Design a binder for these strands. Structure first.
Lengths: 132, 107, 81, 94, 108, 97, 81, 94, 108
DNA sequence: CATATGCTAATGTGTGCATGTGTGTGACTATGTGCGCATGCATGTGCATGTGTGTGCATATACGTGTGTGCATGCATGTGCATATATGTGTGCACGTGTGTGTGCATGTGTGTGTATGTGTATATATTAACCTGTGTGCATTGTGTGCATATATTAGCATGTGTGCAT
DNA sequence: ATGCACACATGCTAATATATGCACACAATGCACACAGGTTAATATATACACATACACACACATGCACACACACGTGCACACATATATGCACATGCATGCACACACGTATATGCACACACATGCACATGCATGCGCACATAGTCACACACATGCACACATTAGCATATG
């Protein structure tokens, strides 16, 4: 309910503190990584300050940023111190929608991609083709 | 909100549990005086005796002998109870320890 | 004399008796149990002592009556005659 | 020679309480042992009671006090009643 | 003389008053024995014997036996709280023990 | 082949031997033990047969009572098997030490 | 007569434990039980032999054993005393 | 009136074993209780020994056997030696 | 007649032989008391008293005390194996207990 | 260089099916029980007898009663202060769970040792009878032991120093 | 390693509990004297021991495995410790009663001794109840087969968050 407006107020104040402290969003991600271990990319911080992320994600990243703004105020010095593969895979589709792992290993060795990368890309290919 | 960390640490420090207990064990195993207060024990003795005869009188030495025997009995029972508690890999005596000691003794 | 004098055997007194027995840690349920045990013991001794006192046609329980009662129960006591 | 025991009296008591029940020789020996043991306990207690009171004679009063000392509650009460009744009947019949 | 009446019949007892008197006299208990002391003691012994024999006869009847054996005496003594207290340090030969298995040892 | 699970025939034996009254030690080895022990007090000692029977009865009663106390000590320690320390504790509490 | 304590066999000790209600027995119980029985028999037999000497006899009687047991607080019924 | 105790004899024994050591009244009472207890135990055992053997006299033999029955090993041996020595000296002097 | 000398001096004892004889005679132990029985009993009592008193004097000296108190008697009795066996069921008033702490209770 | 977009690797939440494990419910198997029939020894009845108990006086004395006394017990009053009690906190102990191993149980087999019977011998236990020595009795003598007072050394009560061990 | 709390060591006063002494009285001793319990020698019998025999059941040893126990780990709460307050114990007196003890008299009662009989005990059969054995009932234990549950994995269903390039 009002959690929406409370998040929005927190985000506006967060933008104000970030601009006042002279930290870029990539620097914010680096600080989050070096103070928690879960380094985040600057796109996530952008979508946060612009309030683009989903509600569950909104709540999930609220506490980390709360802690960072409540902690970093003390001292800053120490804290500071490809398309052809796509086309080939599309060619591999239209004939065998769900290949076996035996074929997956061959595909991975053929195009030089990691086995897990090819497996997840295959799953998401199926996913977006089953959207429609 | 506000800020994490925060003190509150209960600075006051004290002796560890069981150190004062060991000191009292040494102190009371070194001494010989009666460990129960005399007047409450006398009142208990008279109250128990009133159930057998009415308007009984007691010599002071009779109550003293009763207290000596009672304290010796209780101390020996506590020694046996401690052995039973240690047998069960504990350091705390419990009512079942007393019950087992009294069962084995024949009480 | 009074009533309910078993509470006069306080928790610190029972703790001291346990310390003399070499007990390091005491559970909270011990004290009540201890009281019951003590009562039974006293009820066994006094009953015998009064019996001796009743046989002598006396009204005063003497130290010798208690000593004889304790000897009767296999708990002979030295130092009172 | 003659070895005295309580066997015939125990048998009379058994016939009083169980007219159709017998007793084995080992059980009779156990009963004789029990009678001798209780006799010794009561007589020793009565002797000590006479000594504590500077008396030279054991009377029925000493036996009664010894019975109360040696026997548990209900057993002591009933035994005291039986002993008192027997003594009363005896003195009534000289 | 008149007809000799035993002191046991005078006291209404089955146990021997005269023998108890003689045993008290020769047992080195006191230098004198009162007239009523053997009567009281014989009555008490007869009462205790009657209690034990009644309980043992009931035990023998339970086991479909007509003859009392040491096992019946043991069952009678140990099942009676007061007799068990009186004979707590006594071993009865060929009496066995009371059937007793701790509940923790039973299968669940 | 049929096999009873552990503790089943043990309970059967508990019931069997608590129902009975006969001596559980063999008579001849116990007599030999009694004579061997008595040698240390006298030589050329003779025994009445009833004396040896009384000794065996007392010994078995004492051992059975001790085993009951030992079982209570073992159960107190949350076990079902008696151990030498259970016997030692029972004897220490009894005053047989 | 040498080493007769082993005549108290493992099955006999197990039967004695069964009569005592014991369900499970460790393998070290048997030697401890043999030692315990040896001590008990020493005490009783020493007292019984003392009674035999006082009577100037060379035969240990059942009454000697009964008196020895009674002296130790282990009264036995069924053997003349 | 006069109350009899072993206090003076215990004091003489103490002065022999420890010439410069005193004793408190409570400890003297305990010693008196101990002497009476041991006397009663030995005399009761000797009386039972005499009764068992159909004798009417307590002799030094009954006392010696009672000592052997009641005292533990080395205490019993030394007590028997002391008693035998005292009886021998008493007979040699009277 | 002759100058009367006690039987204690004849036996070389300090405990009263005549009093022990009188206590045996009036204690209801047997019909007759032999002459050597009180001497033997008095000697045994004196020996036991001497043993306990010498141990208690040693205990008092260990505590820099010149007077024996019940604590010293208790220490002497409980630290002596045979005397502890003899007085196993005896309570000495104001004697206390032996200092004894189970090693499991000691700090780790 | 630092923000906003489009877009898609990557993870994350959920069914669920299938498989595996644990449980629960009733055939074999073994064992304890209950009659049914036949035997032996062990209990119970019936006699001699001799020993112990009952009877009857006569004597001594232990104890019960009655009086007078002094200790000593119970009760009330008053006191300071050492102890008990209720509270708050934190720690480490008890208890519950899970697990892996090896110890102890159940079982089968071969045997040798216990048991019961039978015999005979010697050793020892018990019994009887003469006697004699040691113990009880009684009484006079008196020396030892106890009770009541002194006189003091030992023990108990504080005050500062002294290690001594615990806990951070 | 240092700080803090506690039990101990030297020293000084003070009192009270012990050690010693004197008077009396009661129990120990000395001296006959009688008598019976205990000793000792001989004897008759009980029974314990030693050997011998056959038999069969229990014991000993080895095997397979199941579950009990010992170890490890996590946790929460019960209990130890410290503190501040108030209760009631210990002490110390003082008084009045009441009861325990001493003492003495005098009788009811226990003992003692002799005799006479009848009660209990040893010995002797008689029989009947406990024991032993074979059959059959009868209870319980333990896989078994199945059924239900739960996992996991894994497939599939959503969200999520970082890359390349677009703005700017």
């Amino acid at each position: 309910k009002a959690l929406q407006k409370e998040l929005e107020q927190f985000a506006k104040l967060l933008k104000q503190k970030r601009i006042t402290l002279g930290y870029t969003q990539a620097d914010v991600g680096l600080t989050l990584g070096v103070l928690f271990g879960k380094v985040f990319s600057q796109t996530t911080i952008c979508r946060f300050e612009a309030l683009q992320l989903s509600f569950k994600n909104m709540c999930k990243l609220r506490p980390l940023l709360q802690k960072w703004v409540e902690e970093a105020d003390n001292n800053e010095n120490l804290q500071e111190i490809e398309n052809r593969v796509r086309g080939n895979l599309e060619n591999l589709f239209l004939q065998c929608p769900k290949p076996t792992l035996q074929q997956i290993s061959h595909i991975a060795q053929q195009l030089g991609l990691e086995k897990d990368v090819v497996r997840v890309w295959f799953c998401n290919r199926r996913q977006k083709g089953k959207r429609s | 909100k506000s800020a994490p960390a925060t003190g509150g640490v209960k600075k006051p420090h004290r002796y560890r549990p069981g150190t004062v207990a060991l000191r009292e064990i040494r102190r009371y195993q070194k001494s010989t005086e009666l460990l129960i207060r005399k007047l409450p024990f006398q009142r208990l003795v008279r109250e128990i005796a009133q159930d057998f005869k009415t308007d009984l009188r007691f010599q002071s030495s009779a109550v003293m002998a009763l207290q000596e025997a009672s304290e010796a009995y209780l101390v020996a029972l506590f020694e046996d109870t401690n052995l039973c508690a240690i047998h069960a890999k504990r350091v705390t005596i419990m009512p079942k320890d007393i019950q087992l000691a009294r069962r084995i003794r024949g009480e | 004399v009074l009533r309910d004098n078993i509470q006069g055997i306080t928790k610190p007194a029972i703790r001291r008796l346990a310390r003399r027995g070499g007990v390091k840690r005491i559970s909270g349920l011990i004290y009540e149990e201890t009281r019951g045990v003590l009562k039974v013991f006293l009820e066994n001794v006094i009953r015998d002592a009064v019996t001796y006192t009743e046989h002598a046609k006396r009204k005063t329980v003497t130290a010798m009556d208690v000593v004889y009662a304790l000897k009767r129960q296999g708990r002979t006591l030295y130092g009172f005659g | 020679t003659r070895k005295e025991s309580y066997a015939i009296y125990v048998y009379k008591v058994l016939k009083q309480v169980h007219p159709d029940t017998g007793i084995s020789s080992k059980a009779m020996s156990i009963m004789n042992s029990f009678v001798n043991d209780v006799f010794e306990r009561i007589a020793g207690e009565a002797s000590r009671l006479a000594h504590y009171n500077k008396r030279s004679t054991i009377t029925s009063r000493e036996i009664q006090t010894a019975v109360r000392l040696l026997l548990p509650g209900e057993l002591a009460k009933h035994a005291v009643s039986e002993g008192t009744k027997a003594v009363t009947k005896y003195t009534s019949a000289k | 003389r008149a007809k000799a009446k035993t002191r046991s019949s005078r006291a209404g007892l089955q146990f021997p008053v005269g023998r108890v008197h003689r045993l008290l006299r020769k047992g080195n208990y006191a230098e004198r024995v009162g007239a009523g002391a053997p009567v009281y003691l014989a009555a008490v012994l007869e009462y205790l014997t009657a209690e034990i024999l009644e309980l043992a006869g009931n035990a023998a009847r339970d086991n479909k036996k007509t003859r009392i054996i040491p096992r019946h005496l043991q069952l009678a003594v140990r099942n009676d709280e007061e007799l068990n207290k009186l004979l707590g340090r006594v071993t009865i030969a060929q009496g066995g023990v009371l059937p007793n298995i701790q509940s923790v040892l039973l299968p669940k």
